[PDB]
Subunit: 202 residues, 6 copies
């Protein structure tokens, strides 16, 4: 990271590997990635991505997304030989740390004002991670129906777990409740809160 | 958190501690003070980071947004809001929750002399919501905590006050043997005294 | 704790206190661990630590009663118009316990020259309460620690002093064989000597 | 590593490297972990880390051969001759970069010189060359043998495909070819230029 | 410990000492671990560490007796009206043990130029007591460490010297070897090293 | 270790790491470089601290003293041996921290130029640790023969594991018939990578 270039710590390295081992591409992996990559350089981001073993389908999908974003960046911000000793503008492949050196990355990130290549690359990675999370999501919200014996709260957990991978209350949530709870919910007037709905089916 | 005045990253130890607490204790009451301690110094972004890392409990987490919203809207009522160039704008409710504010703005408010402590304000909101969740996930009313016929007084009292924390009766709801003894201590007895007398 | 400014309680500290209470309940050595883990602590930090304890809510309520007696007694010995502007007010008992005081006030008192050490005072109260709890949860009277007919002397002595810590007799309560030997050492024998003689 | 003076390798670092090797052997992701754990490393630190590995001594000896080829090639490109100028900084031979004939002070000297001779980063590059050769060796399967099972979900196939490939455009050639008949037909119907995301959706 | 001001004992330190005692009781190597974990310690820190030990209360009471003998002997060798105002008093034995001294007084002595190292003195006392405990909890006399008829020489030697360390080679080691190895060892005759003895019975 | 230039305490992480390594790996060869890394910056006292925390292996630990002594005595031979307030020269027993104080150790180590008593003592300890590692080594390289069903790579692991505790002369010789024939056909100058590919 940049704090000066600090090395990624062992605690950070291990935390990212473990999260991926234990949670695959469950949605909460994304904010953990983002938090664990606080201050990160493109190199640090590549380091973190490279340490993931397995999920190589997902990881290759992630490269495709990163590429689309690199190419689009080159469209919006185009770039002879550079002025000697001066700071060049970064191409998309520089933001991803493919054609840039660590010193160049630090240069951009600490420049006054900053070209925050870390934060830009992170944004791209997260775009790709979100696409993966939807893909690895096993179920459509349309198929989250409350079991005949399922407590309302557990249903709601599934409902919103599923929804996070891809107003909700007033449409599909009541619709997809089981008959007993659906009747009770319908009897509550418009504009009922989730707290209220859950109390009423407890 | 905040560490010329600049954002320190949330540490891995902090991140993991919060996830684990939620995994192991769900919405048992002591999760709240742990959240508060683990979020010492936190910016709104750090608070959002911590909340977002929770997997599961998405009913609870959506309930939490509703509460946060009520508090945001009420804040906009009490403290209403083009801004002077290069000066510090006043934060709306959605800025305190880190929805419409940047990290730099959050640091700005928090380190301003005097401080607008948007971290502490947002934390207060989150805790309001966390308390509502804790009551919800509380399985039992204090009215239903009755001492078992063979239950030692101390275990009863643990349950009594466990239940009460999630939300006279104590003697009332004791079992006949211990109720008689307690009544004989008469007014003003301490809990230590009650517990000794039924040991 | 304090560094003049508040350092956050660390995750390692938070977890250590929770684990100690989970694993050892109110065994006597929990007290010195609490005291060590709360080194430097503000009243807020002490409340944070106490609040993170799940379970034992009977004990925790007992602890409040004790804290209250000590708060009231403090108000007796050190009584307190509106304060001089911008000057440091004297702390009431409820301020020492962090109930009616702010963090800044706590830091104020603790770092003042000379210090009003509200952290150390509150800690002293908590430990008073923790000691009462430890005696309560102590299962056995020292009067009932008798050496088994087949029990090695050392194990007896461990139990003897374990029990005694939670709250002459030692020789008295030894088993016949070892009692005879001990009596033969006659007055002024050391514990090392007693234990060698019954090994 | 370096702080101008040598900081010790930390216990956390030492243990992390040993554990990675214990748990993952020479699976590909060991390499970037080695590289990250050896951030800031001196040649001595790199030797320390390599020496703490128990087992895999075939691999570790193979690694020396590779390091040697790179040392010798370095001596070809950057030669040295007489006795050195008193009190001055000598140029490093290949065996100096590997920390075999160099002192810690010399390593720090080169690494912190203005401008730096980054002997740590050079030696690391060599080690990684050798680690890659080992990873291919310990790779059990050729990409040519990664065929989708008749009941294997496309995604699992793709995981294996690219796991295998990492140890040694791929989509358009062998990936479709080696898919199972049902999914191969579907993929062929998408025709040129399909993305991996698209292929995977179509066989889900 | 000390940084002039008191640093708190760390949780890592606290836990390490408790665990050592839980896992190894009063095996000899607990002593040097205690000493290392108590580097820089004040008398208060030493009391803190001793107080966190649960169980072994016989041993812990024995330890007080030893500490007392050393306190009283210290008062004999270094005897002590009311003190000069604002000046540094001389420490009595009970001050070194942190019984009648404040933390500030302990820091005072320890950081004075020149130092009265009350931490190191108290540590020395504690270790004296810990050694007496280690001998006590030692189950076996070196006289009873005999090599089993099937026991490899090396294992015997481990036990021999384990036992010997708790009490604190040309004689008893050969003597107590089993017949087969005893004959071989005797044939090496005077002046054999342990390395040589062990090779010869491997 | 060392940071008035002053002694930093050995950390709990360091202390525990050394104890655990010895518990889990005994005197397998890789314990040595771990000892050396964990004892980075160490004073003689720190080295004694680390050695003293080892429970068990007291045969080995006594053997280690013998080796340390030989090296102490030899040091006294090569460098024989005071002015008020000045720095005395260290005897062998001073390097091992037996007759020296912590302050003296720090003195030597931070003197300009340094008398690196930590590094010297470490060198001695490692000499002794190496003798122990050979001793606890169960097998001679002469007895590492490839099993009839053993994959070449596993054989090579054993070969070099064994060899480290104490190449392609004995390595090919001791291979199993099938692989030995193939290896011999590669003829002089084959690399280990090549040998291993050819028997995979
Ligand atoms: N044609 C073909 C297809 C597959 C294979 S393969 O399956 O055998 N194999 C290739 C090698 N790696 C490692 C790798 O390239 N890792 C990235 C980081 C990364 C890891 C991920 F798991 C997922 C990500 F999205 C990004 C990397 N590591 C760096 C390390 C040290 C310095 C530099 C780099 C750097 O640059 N990158 C890297 C970063 C971004 C891209 S890009 O594809 O997204 N891109 C291209 C240039 O324009 C900008 C964006 C490519 C590589 C593999 O993952 C798997 C081989 C050939
Ligand atoms: N109707 C409907 C129903 C479900 C879904 S969903 O299930 O698909 N989905 C939405 C997206 N996220 C992430 C998210 O929004 N997280 C919050 C923090 C948070 C996490 C919690 F688990 C619980 C909380 F209460 C708060 C957030 N993450 C940030 C991250 C990076 C920068 C900024 C933010 C920021 O601002 N917030 C955020 C904070 C507060 C609110 S608010 O709803 O309470 N609010 C609205 C504006 O006024 C201020 C207060 C909203 C978002 C999800 O978790 C779930 C979508 C629509
Ligand atoms: N009559 C009755 C019976 C039960 C319940 S209840 O079961 O619903 N419930 C209420 C809430 N809490 C939390 C709580 O109050 N925690 C304390 C710290 C503490 C925790 C313990 F587990 C044990 C202790 F002894 C002390 C606290 N937390 C703070 C946090 C943030 C800022 C401030 C505070 C602060 O001030 N205190 C606090 C500290 C001391 C006291 S006191 O009662 O001892 N006291 C009163 C004023 O005079 C000084 C001393 C009260 C609260 C509960 O545990 C129990 C409610 C009413
Ligand atoms: N012919 C033959 C066959 C087997 C054996 S053996 O099996 O009995 N045995 C020998 C001793 N070591 C330790 C060792 O050499 N370790 C290396 C680091 C290292 C570890 C690895 F596991 C793998 C690597 F590739 C590199 C080392 N440790 C240092 C430590 C303290 C200071 C200095 C050193 C230093 O210099 N090196 C070292 C580093 C590189 C090489 S080299 O062979 O690659 N090379 C030689 C000169 O030109 C530069 C490069 C040699 C030694 C063993 O592990 C194995 C001995 C001879
Ligand atoms: N007659 C009789 C006999 C036993 C019992 S009892 O079984 O109920 N017993 C259990 C143990 N503790 C704790 C305790 O005293 N801990 C010591 C340190 C210590 C712990 C050990 F486990 C072992 C040690 F050897 C030393 C202590 N804790 C401090 C903490 C906060 C500030 C101060 C202190 C301080 O001063 N000391 C302390 C240290 C040394 C001694 S001394 O006895 O060795 N001594 C007396 C004065 O002259 C100097 C030396 C006494 C207390 C008790 O209170 C009482 C009750 C009545
Ligand atoms: N004849 C006979 C035979 C056995 C026994 S015994 O089995 O009962 N024995 C076991 C071990 N210890 C502790 C001990 O001596 N530990 C060493 C460090 C060490 C530990 C090891 F496991 C292995 C090593 F090689 C070195 C030590 N601890 C220090 C601590 C605090 C300050 C100082 C010291 C210091 O000096 N040394 C120490 C270091 C080196 C040597 S020496 O033997 O190698 N030597 C002698 C003088 O010339 C220089 C070198 C001796 C002691 C005992 O006292 C009791 C007693 C008498």
């Amino acid at each position: 990271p940049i704090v000066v270039h600090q090395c990624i710590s062992p605690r950070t390295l291990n935390a990212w590997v473990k999260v991926v081992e234990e949670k695959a591409f469950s949605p909460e992996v994304i904010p953990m990635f983002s938090a664990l990559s606080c201050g990160a350089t493109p190199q640090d981001l590549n380091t973190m991505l490279n340490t993931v073993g397995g999920h190589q389908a997902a990881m290759q999908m992630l490269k495709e997304t990163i590429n689309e974003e690199a190419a689009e960046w080159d469209r919006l911000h185009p770039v002879g030989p550079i002025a000697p000793g001066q700071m060049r503008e970064p191409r998309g492949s520089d933001i991803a740390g493919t054609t840039s050196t660590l010193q160049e990355q630090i240069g951009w990130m600490t420049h006054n004002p900053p070209i925050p290549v870390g934060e830009i690359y992170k944004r791209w990675i997260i775009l790709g991670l979100n696409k993966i999370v939807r893909m690895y999501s096993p179920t459509s919200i349309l198929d989250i129906r409350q079991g005949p014996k399922e407590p309302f709260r557990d249903y709601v957990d599934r409902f919103y777990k599923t929804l996070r991978a891809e107003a909700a209350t007033e449409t599909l949530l009541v619709q997809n409740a089981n008959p007993d709870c659906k009747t009770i919910l319908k009897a509550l007037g418009p504009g009922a809160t989730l707290e209220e709905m859950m109390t009423a089916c407890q």
